[PDB]
Motif scaffolding. Structure first.
Motif, PDB file in Angstrom:
ATOM      1  N   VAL B 156       0.851  -1.192   0.000  1.00  0.00           N
ATOM      2  CA  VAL B 156       0.000   0.000   0.000  1.00  0.00           C
ATOM      3  C   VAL B 156       0.886   1.241   0.000  1.00  0.00           C
ATOM      4  O   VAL B 156       1.744   1.385   0.888  1.00  0.00           O
ATOM      5  CB  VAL B 156      -0.932  -0.011   1.209  1.00  0.00           C
ATOM      6  N   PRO B 157       0.729   2.148  -0.961  1.00  0.00           N
ATOM      7  CA  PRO B 157       1.595   3.327  -1.006  1.00  0.00           C
ATOM      8  C   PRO B 157       1.371   4.235   0.190  1.00  0.00           C
ATOM      9  O   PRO B 157       0.268   4.327   0.735  1.00  0.00           O
ATOM     10  CB  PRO B 157       1.184   4.016  -2.312  1.00  0.00           C
ATOM     11  N   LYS B 158       2.439   4.914   0.596  1.00  0.00           N
ATOM     12  CA  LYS B 158       2.408   5.816   1.744  1.00  0.00           C
ATOM     13  C   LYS B 158       2.021   7.205   1.250  1.00  0.00           C
ATOM     14  O   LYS B 158       2.865   7.966   0.772  1.00  0.00           O
ATOM     15  CB  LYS B 158       3.753   5.826   2.461  1.00  0.00           C
ATOM     16  N   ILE B 159       0.739   7.530   1.369  1.00  0.00           N
ATOM     17  CA  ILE B 159       0.201   8.824   0.966  1.00  0.00           C
ATOM     18  C   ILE B 159       0.028   9.688   2.205  1.00  0.00           C
ATOM     19  O   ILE B 159      -0.272   9.180   3.293  1.00  0.00           O
ATOM     20  CB  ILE B 159      -1.133   8.659   0.212  1.00  0.00           C
ATOM     21  N   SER B 160       0.227  10.993   2.048  1.00  0.00           N
ATOM     22  CA  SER B 160       0.063  11.911   3.164  1.00  0.00           C
ATOM     23  C   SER B 160      -1.379  11.899   3.653  1.00  0.00           C
ATOM     24  O   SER B 160      -2.324  11.891   2.861  1.00  0.00           O
ATOM     25  CB  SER B 160       0.467  13.326   2.762  1.00  0.00           C
ATOM     26  N   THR B 161      -1.542  11.897   4.976  1.00  0.00           N
ATOM     27  CA  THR B 161      -2.870  11.810   5.562  1.00  0.00           C
ATOM     28  C   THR B 161      -3.658  13.105   5.424  1.00  0.00           C
ATOM     29  O   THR B 161      -4.871  13.104   5.655  1.00  0.00           O
ATOM     30  CB  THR B 161      -2.763  11.412   7.032  1.00  0.00           C
ATOM     31  N   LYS B 162      -3.003  14.204   5.059  1.00  0.00           N
ATOM     32  CA  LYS B 162      -3.687  15.445   4.731  1.00  0.00           C
ATOM     33  C   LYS B 162      -4.032  15.552   3.253  1.00  0.00           C
ATOM     34  O   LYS B 162      -4.729  16.492   2.860  1.00  0.00           O
ATOM     35  CB  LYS B 162      -2.837  16.647   5.149  1.00  0.00           C
ATOM     36  N   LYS B 163      -3.566  14.617   2.426  1.00  0.00           N
ATOM     37  CA  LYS B 163      -3.950  14.557   1.017  1.00  0.00           C
ATOM     38  C   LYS B 163      -5.286  13.830   0.954  1.00  0.00           C
ATOM     39  O   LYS B 163      -5.353  12.613   0.775  1.00  0.00           O
ATOM     40  CB  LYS B 163      -2.877  13.867   0.186  1.00  0.00           C
ATOM     41  N   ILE B 164      -6.364  14.590   1.132  1.00  0.00           N
ATOM     42  CA  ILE B 164      -7.693  13.996   1.223  1.00  0.00           C
ATOM     43  C   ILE B 164      -8.109  13.394  -0.113  1.00  0.00           C
ATOM     44  O   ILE B 164      -8.624  12.271  -0.172  1.00  0.00           O
ATOM     45  CB  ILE B 164      -8.708  15.044   1.711  1.00  0.00           C
ATOM     46  N   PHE B 165      -7.890  14.123  -1.202  1.00  0.00           N
ATOM     47  CA  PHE B 165      -8.357  13.721  -2.521  1.00  0.00           C
ATOM     48  C   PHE B 165      -7.174  13.479  -3.449  1.00  0.00           C
ATOM     49  O   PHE B 165      -6.214  14.256  -3.457  1.00  0.00           O
ATOM     50  CB  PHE B 165      -9.284  14.781  -3.116  1.00  0.00           C
ATOM     51  N   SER B 166      -7.251  12.401  -4.223  1.00  0.00           N
ATOM     52  CA  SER B 166      -6.284  12.089  -5.261  1.00  0.00           C
ATOM     53  C   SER B 166      -6.971  12.086  -6.620  1.00  0.00           C
ATOM     54  O   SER B 166      -8.168  11.815  -6.736  1.00  0.00           O
ATOM     55  CB  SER B 166      -5.619  10.732  -5.006  1.00  0.00           C
ATOM     56  N   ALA B 167      -6.196  12.400  -7.654  1.00  0.00           N
ATOM     57  CA  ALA B 167      -6.726  12.422  -9.010  1.00  0.00           C
ATOM     58  C   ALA B 167      -6.628  11.074  -9.705  1.00  0.00           C
ATOM     59  O   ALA B 167      -7.422  10.794 -10.611  1.00  0.00           O
ATOM     60  CB  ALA B 167      -6.002  13.478  -9.847  1.00  0.00           C
ATOM     61  N   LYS B 168      -5.679  10.232  -9.310  1.00  0.00           N
ATOM     62  CA  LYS B 168      -5.493   8.922  -9.911  1.00  0.00           C
ATOM     63  C   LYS B 168      -5.639   7.834  -8.857  1.00  0.00           C
ATOM     64  O   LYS B 168      -5.298   8.029  -7.687  1.00  0.00           O
ATOM     65  CB  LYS B 168      -4.120   8.812 -10.582  1.00  0.00           C
TER      66      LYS B 168
END
Lengths: 126, 174, 99, 50, 62, 52
Positions: B156-168
């Motif tokens: 599972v990729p480590k995405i920032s927890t404040k990055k609520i929305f992703s485009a892809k």
RNA sequence: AGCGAAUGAACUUUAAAUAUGUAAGAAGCCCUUGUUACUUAACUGAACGUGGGCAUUCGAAUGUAUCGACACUAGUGGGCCAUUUUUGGUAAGCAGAACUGGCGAUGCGGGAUGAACCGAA
RNA sequence: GGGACCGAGGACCGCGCUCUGCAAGGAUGCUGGCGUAAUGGUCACCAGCGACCCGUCUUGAAACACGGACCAAGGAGUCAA
């Protein structure tokens, strides 16, 4: 035993004689006598109230009462203080008249020669 | 539990005229700090011998650290834990870099698998397995298996927890 | 040093007077030989003959809540991961937090 | 001024004396037990209920 | 100074007249001769000093 | 009229303790130790350390 | 703990944990000899006094936002819950004493909510 | 180095220091717009959070019970021995 008025007395409360049985609260107490009779002795004791302390009077006979030595310790301390201060004055040196509250220990070294420490497991298995 | 280090404690009964130069008992324990180390040493000494805190003193407390914290070691821990039925023995094995890490993992694993707590767990003997053929547990055997290589599927990729929305839509391959 | 310098108040005639002057230190503790804040700190740290008088003169140090919190469960003994009890040399860190 | 200078000197000398005694005991093969602390700071941090 | 520790005294107006009182106070503190409220025992310190000087614990020559 | 902290105000610190200037100028908080070769730890100490 | 000390909870060199009564100075101890109607074979003891001794650490700590005595005056005389210890009993309940703690006359934060919980006045 | 809140007092005295002076017993200096509903205050409504209807009586406490349609005036420890 011979007991006079004004001395401090301890109460033991044995089960040999049931006459003049005191309460469990008066069992194992210390007090000063005020009345002396043929067999029973009038003793003033300090009882603990739910928020204070009061003085009560009881009658305990000879078989439970015995003298104490708290005043003996006080008097022997007075005698020792007097003798020590006289000796100090004679020898021209100061001495500690009071008694110390047992200050902590100082630093020292402990050798390991012929005293190798032994390792101990938390529980002993044998 | 916490951050631990090796604590080797020597303590002795207070010298008296009857028995000067006492036995100078020693033992190595795991504590987060020196106060806890001394408290555990005194508790264990009370349990074993008839020596108490008041009638004793701590001759020395030193931190034992690892000889080689950079090389991977296998550790066997023999421990006794008391549960509702009684005291039970376990030998368990851990693949770590230090006895400190082994004991940390052992507390964590005992809490996870048996709900045994710090005062319910006794550390009887922790050893470093000098070579293979001393490992008895299949998981550490498969860890020491020859030419061990494995992938990491479904990472599972480590995405920032404040990055609520992703485009892809994220990928789980690398 | 910091407890005396920052939160040091003396009991002058039953009043809480900040220790702003070696002079007032001298009137209150001059008969014991303590004539300055350095003397008071020496007598407290190195427990001297007149430690009782020095500590009694010192009003109880009113500390604040620690900066950084106590611990997740502060009402058990320090040796089981709490905050109460005898933290031998860690009370220095507690004083740092509380000043 | 003079009293403070000697106080600073005494603090440093006591620290180095403790360190040196521990080291010399370690070198001679014994264990030096430091003197128990003589001063305690106590903070009342709990309420008065119950 | 070395034998009695005695942090340096305040010289005060003039010399010696009150320096001896400060010496008495410091020697009393060092030896442990105090009062009820912690008053230093200046005269007991003086007696200890003179006894030690008679015993030879303090050097001195003309 | 105010209680000024001597640990923040240098002037109150100088008023209370005149030795602060000398302490700072002589760097008494940065005093190095002696210059001598320290003896190695004894093998008896090492063996007692790793006895178990 | 031991009985490689004796003897055999009722054994002991030693001695736990745990609460608990008394005492800790000039508001003192003695020692010394004058009297007494008390007492003794007796200037002999007891009481009443004289002299001495320590005023500085005067006889542990720590606190001390003063303590004691007399006189006068108002409201009070209920209990409930709980910890610990303890007596009795039941199938289980439960009943009775002792200490201490919360409620009264007490607001505030938390436990979604709430006399009896946690923090804190 | 950055930020926040605060400026109590009103000639001098004092402790001091790095002493032509000073961050030393409590804020001064410079500048701008406006100089009027602009600041500020009061009413009505909205919004966020908070919030049981008062008194009496009993009891350890609640609960119950009692009194309360609204307003104006009157309305209950006084006098003598």
């Amino acid at each position: 035993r011979t007991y006079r008025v004004g001395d401090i007395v301890d109460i033991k409360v044995n089960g040999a004689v049931q006459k003049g049985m005191p309460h469990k609260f008066y069992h194992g107490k210390t007090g000063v006598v005020y009345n002396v009779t043929k067999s029973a002795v009038g003793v003033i004791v300090y009882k603990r109230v739910k928020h204070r302390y009061i003085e009560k009077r009881i009658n305990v006979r000879i078989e439970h009462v015995k003298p104490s030595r708290s005043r003996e310790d006080f008097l022997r301390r007075v005698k020792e203080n007097a003798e020590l201060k006289k000796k100090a004055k004679a020898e021209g040196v100061p001495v500690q008249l009071k008694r110390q509250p047992a200050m902590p220990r100082e630093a020292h070294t402990v050798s390991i020669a012929d005293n190798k420490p032994v390792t101990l497991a938390p529980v002993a298995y044998e | 539990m916490g951050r631990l280090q090796e604590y080797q404690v020597i303590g002795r009964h207070l010298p008296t005229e009857a028995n000067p130069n006492p036995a100078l008992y020693r033992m190595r324990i795991f504590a987060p700090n020196e106060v806890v180390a001394k408290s555990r040493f005194w508790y264990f000494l009370r349990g074993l011998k008839k020596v108490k805190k008041a009638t004793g003193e701590i001759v020395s407390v030193n931190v034992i650290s690892e000889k080689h914290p950079l090389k991977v070691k296998n550790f066997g821990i023999w421990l006794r834990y008391d549960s509702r039925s009684g005291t039970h023995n376990m030998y368990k094995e851990y693949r770590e870099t230090s006895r400190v890490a082994a004991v940390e993992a052992m507390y964590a694993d005992m809490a996870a698998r048996h709900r045994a707590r710090f005062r319910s767990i006794h550390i009887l003997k922790v050893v470093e397995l000098e070579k293979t053929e001393d490992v008895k547990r299949p998981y550490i055997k498969q860890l020491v298996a020859k030419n061990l290589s494995f992938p990491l599927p479904h990472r599972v990729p480590k995405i920032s927890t404040k990055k609520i929305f992703s485009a892809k839509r994220p990928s789980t391959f690398s | 040093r910091e407890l005396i310098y920052k939160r040091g108040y003396g009991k002058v005639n039953g009043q809480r007077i900040p220790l702003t002057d070696n002079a007032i230190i001298e009137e209150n503790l001059g008969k014991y030989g303590i004539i300055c804040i350095e003397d008071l700190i020496h007598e407290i740290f190195t427990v001297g003959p007149n430690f009782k008088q020095a500590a009694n003169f010192l009003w109880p140090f009113k500390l604040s809540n620690p900066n950084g919190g106590f611990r997740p469960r502060k009402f058990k003994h320090f040796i089981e991961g709490g905050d109460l009890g005898n933290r031998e040399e860690h009370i220095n860190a507690l004083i740092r937090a509380m000043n | 001024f003079k009293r403070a200078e000697k106080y600073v000197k005494e603090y440093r000398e006591q620290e180095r004396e403790k360190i040196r005694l521990a080291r010399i005991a370690k070198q001679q093969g014994s264990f030096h037990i430091p003197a128990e602390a003589k001063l305690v700071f106590v903070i009342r941090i709990k309420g008065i209920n119950k | 100074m070395q034998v009695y520790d005695i942090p340096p005294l305040l010289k005060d107006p003039s010399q010696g007249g009150d320096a001896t009182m400060d010496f008495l106070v410091q020697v009393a503190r060092k030896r442990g001769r105090l009062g009820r409220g912690g008053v230093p025992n200046i005269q007991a310190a003086a007696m200890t000093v003179v006894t030690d000087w008679r015993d030879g614990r303090i050097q001195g020559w003309t | 009229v105010q209680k000024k902290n001597p640990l923040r105000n240098k002037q109150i610190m100088l008023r209370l303790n005149p030795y602060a200037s000398t302490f700072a100028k002589e760097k008494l908080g940065e005093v190095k130790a002696e210059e001598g070769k320290p003896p190695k730890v004894p093998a008896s100490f090492k063996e007692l350390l790793h006895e178990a």
